[PDB]
Design a protein around this ligand. Structure first.
Ligand SMILES: O=C(CS)Nc1n[nH]cc1-c1ccc(F)cc1
Ligand SMILES: [Zn+2]
Length: 402
C-alpha cells in the first residue's frame, strides 16, 4: 500500500508536470496561494500542466450562495471530508493519477491537448478594435515576495461543495455575453472527487445473477473534461434543451444515447456554431490594439485554437473542413462511451442507468493502476471486471449511506 505507481513506464509523468506533495513549499510558479475572482482567504493550489490548476479543497468559493458545507433541511454529505492535510495530499495524488490514466489512452491525449489549446477568447473590450482579456478567466497567483500576478487559465479541478457526490463543470458568466455558447469559451471549474464513486448493476453472462459494480473514477473525470471541452470552445448546447436530462448530457455520454438528438437538429447546431466562429475571425481581423504582449501574436494564439486559415494578405477565415473536423472531435468523438471502449472497463450502458455510493482510495498502486484501473492484470481482478465488482473486490469499496 506504499508506492502510488504514478510512472509505470519511462522516467517521469507524461501530462502532470510534477510529483507534488501537499506539503511542498509555495513557490511563485506551480505551487502557490491563489484567489479566485470573487472575498476569500487565499487557498493553496498546484499547477499540474500549462493552463490547468488543482485546488485540493471543498468548493465553498465559486458560488456566493454555497459558502458552507452543511446540508439543507441521490446525495451524500460529510462536512469533515477533505479537511485534513493528509486528505488534501491524497486528493491531489488521486487527481494526478486519473489525469495520467486518461493521458495513457490515445483518446485522452487528443482530448487533453484540445482542452489545453482551448484558451478563453479575449473578448473583454467594448471597443470592437481592441482585444482584451475577460478577468473571470484568470486567477490571482501569490508570489514568494507576497505580490500577486494575474494568470490566465483554462481549467480548475476543485473538491465538491456541500453535496459530496454532485460533480459538475461550471464557469463564471458574463453580464452580456454567453461565453459557453458563442464560440468564446471561459475558464471551467470542475467539482470532482477521486475519493468516492458510484455503483451500478450488471449481469455477466452460472445461475446468472445480478452483479454490483462500481464506476471507474477515470470515466467520471473524463465525462466532466468532455463538458469542459465543449464549454472552452463555446459550443455547449443551451442547458434549457432537455428530454422527458439535457441534450448536453446525452451528447457527452455518447453511444446510442446521442442518437436521440435528431440529425436535423444537430445540423442546425453545427451551422450556428460555424457562424459564431466566423464572427470571431472577423473580430480578430478588425483588431488594431490590445490592452495589457502583441496584437498579431494573441491573434495567432486564436488562429491556432480555432484552426483558422490565413491568406497571403494576413486575413483570418474559417475553413469548413477544419471546422467540421474540430466540431466533430469535440462533440462526437470525445464521449464517455468512447472512453469506456479505450479503458476496457464496465460502465453504465445508458446515461440514466443506481443509488449506491462507495468510499475508495485509488492512490496505492496495489488498489488501482494507470493502465488497468481496478482490474489488475495477472490477478483474479483482471477477469470479468472482477476489480470493479464490489463484492469480489470488497477491500476496495466501502458502502456509505445513500
Ligand atoms: O451527472 C452529472 C452531470 S455532469 N454529474 C454527476 N454528479 N455526481 C456524479 C456525476 C457523474 C458525472 C459523470 C459520470 F460519468 C458519472 C457521474
Ligand atoms: Zn455530465
Amino acid at each position: 500500500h506504499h508506492s502510488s505507481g504514478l510512472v509505470p513506464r519511462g522516467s517521469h509523468m507524461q501530462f502532470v508536470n510534477k510529483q507534488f506533495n501537499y506539503k511542498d513549499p509555495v513557490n511563485g510558479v506551480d505551487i502557490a496561494y491563489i484567489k479566485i475572482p470573487n472575498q476569500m482567504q487565499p487557498v493553496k493550489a498546484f499547477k499540474i500542466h500549462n493552463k490547468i490548476w488543482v485546488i485540493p479543497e471543498r468548493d465553498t468559493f465559486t458560488n456566493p450562495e454555497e459558502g458552507d458545507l452543511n446540508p439543507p433541511p441521490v446525495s451524500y454529505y460529510d462536512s469533515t471530508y477533505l479537511s485534513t492535510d493528509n486528505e488534501k495530499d491524497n486528493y491531489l495524488k488521486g487527481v494526478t493519477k486519473l489525469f495520467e490514466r486518461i493521458y495513457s489512452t490515445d483518446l485522452g491525449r487528443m482530448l487533453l491537448t484540445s482542452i489545453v489549446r482551448g484558451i478563453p477568447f479575449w473578448g473583454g473590450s467594448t471597443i470592437d478594435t481592441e482585444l482584451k482579456v475577460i478577468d473571470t478567466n484568470c486567477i490571482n497567483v501569490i508570489q514568494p515576495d507576497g505580490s500577486y500576478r494575474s494568470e490566465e487559465l483554462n481549467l480548475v479541478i476543485i473538491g465538491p461543495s456541500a453535496d459530496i457526490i454532485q460533480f459538475e463543470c461550471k464557469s463564471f458568466g458574463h453580464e452580456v455575453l454567453n461565453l459557453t455558447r458563442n464560440g468564446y469559451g471561459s475558464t471551467q471549474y470542475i467539482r470532482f472527487s477521486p475519493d468516492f464513486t458510484f455503483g451500478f448493476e450488471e449481469s455477466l453472462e452460472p445461475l446468472l445473477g445480478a452483479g454490483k459494480f462500481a464506476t471507474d473514477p477515470a470515466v467520471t473525470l473524463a465525462h466532466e473534461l468532455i463538458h469542459a471541452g465543449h464549454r472552452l470552445y463555446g459550443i455547449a448546447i443551451n442547458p434549457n434543451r432537455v428530454f422527458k436530462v439535457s441534450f448536453e448530457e446525452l451528447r457527452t455520454f455518447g453511444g446510442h444515447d446521442a442518437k436521440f438528438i435528431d440529425s436535423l437538429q444537430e445540423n442546425e447546431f453545427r451551422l450556428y456554431y460555424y457562424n459564431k466562429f466566423k464572427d470571431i475571425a472577423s473580430t480578430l481581423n478588425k483588431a488594431k490594439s490590445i490592452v495589457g504582449a502583441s496584437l498579431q501574436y494573441m491573434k495567432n494564439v486564436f488562429k491556432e485554437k480555432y484552426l483558422l486559415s490565413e491568406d497571403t494578405s494576413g486575413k483570418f477565415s474559417v475553413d469548413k473542413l477544419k471546422f467540421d473536423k474540430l466540431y466533430k472531435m469535440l462533440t462526437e468523438i470525445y464521449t464517455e462511451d468512447n472512453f469506456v471502449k479505450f479503458f476496457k472497463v464496465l460502465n453504465r450502458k445508458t446515461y440514466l442507468n443506481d443509488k449506491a455510493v462507495f468510499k475508495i482510495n485509488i492512490v496505492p498502486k496495489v488498489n488501482y493502476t494507470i493502465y488497468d484501473g481496478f482490474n489488475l492484470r495477472n490477478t483474479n481482478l483482471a477477469a470479468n471486471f472482477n476489480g470493479q465488482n464490489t463484492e469480489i473486490n470488497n477491500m476496495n469499496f466501502t458502502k456509505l449511506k445513500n
